[PDB]
Write a protein that binds this ligand. Sequence first.
Ligand code: ATP
Ligand code: MN
Ligand code: MN
Length: 339
Amino acid sequence: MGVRKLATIRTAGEITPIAGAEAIECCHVDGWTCVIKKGEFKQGDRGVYFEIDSFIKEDNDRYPMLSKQVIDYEGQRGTRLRTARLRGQLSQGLFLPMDRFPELASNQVGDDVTEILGITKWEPPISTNLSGEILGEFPTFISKTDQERVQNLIPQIEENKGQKFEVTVMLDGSSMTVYRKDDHIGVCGRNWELRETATNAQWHAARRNKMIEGLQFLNRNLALQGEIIGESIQGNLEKLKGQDFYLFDIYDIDKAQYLTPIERQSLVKQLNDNGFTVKHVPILDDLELNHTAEQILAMADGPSLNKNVKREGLVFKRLDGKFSFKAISNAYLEKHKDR
Ligand SMILES: Nc1ncnc2c1ncn2[C@@H]1O[C@H](COP(=O)(O)OP(=O)(O)OP(=O)(O)O)[C@@H](O)[C@H]1O
Ligand SMILES: [Mn+2]
Ligand SMILES: [Mn+2]
């Protein structure tokens, strides 16, 4: 969805020493924790925070601390920021003081500086198993699947205290959307509506679980959104044989809004009552929110759909369907260096 805010002006939170490493210290930036050089910031200072996945073009003047990690990526020379562990200290992102960015002297706390600093987004490769023939743009009348990170929602998490959330396991696969709009039924990946052919994985998942017939039956303008997971998709964390679709959302095209967890669970039951075989992402107990970002992140480690593997994380969706976010497990990002 759109353009992610990879580089933004943010405020130095609590600064804590790293025992046994005098030259560095730990800086809290929103719900992120970042290793910084001793002295670069005091608590309350502003800086440009670059999130993990930032791709930072080689620059020995501005980004000398990245020199050793410069790779070749999409025909560009630069550095991919990723989760790391230093001295036993979890570190994610880069935080650089404002006087490194004279062109940002008149900007404000909160501003997105991704474009102006020419930062781009690194991402894992698409499973060429799932790059299909493109029929069309992702429909403008359906929301792309997107969840903000809990680390970026400190004030929101505060505000939602007392609110109840559906908790589901975050599956690591590829987003897929199967929808009906009047006389058209279509299957999309994360970014594009796809043509049906013999080798198209998403179309095949949709036929196999009878989800097009399912949409024909409900006779509503609805987009069924879920994760296609399994063999040859993002390394197959779940150790499935073959591939399959797990629903996580239903988007009401005529109303332009997501269905609430309750409405969504009812439709899935009716679908399955009528023989349409739609599986859902694993649903945990509802959570009454009363937590810091750090506590939410602790919860995110745990078993997956396959209980013998550690999950990518958890997705929280408010019972009214209008607020949601993801807590990616930091254990998972430490275990999986291509994440
Ligand atoms: N239980 C779930 N609830 C909602 N989405 C889920 C769930 N399980 C897996 N997903 C997938 O999680 C994705 C959102 O988080 P994810 O980190 O995978 O996004 P991304 O597209 O890699 O974007 P970025 O990493 O740039 O933020 C959705 O696009 C969807 O495909
Ligand atoms: Mn991602
Ligand atoms: Mn994903």
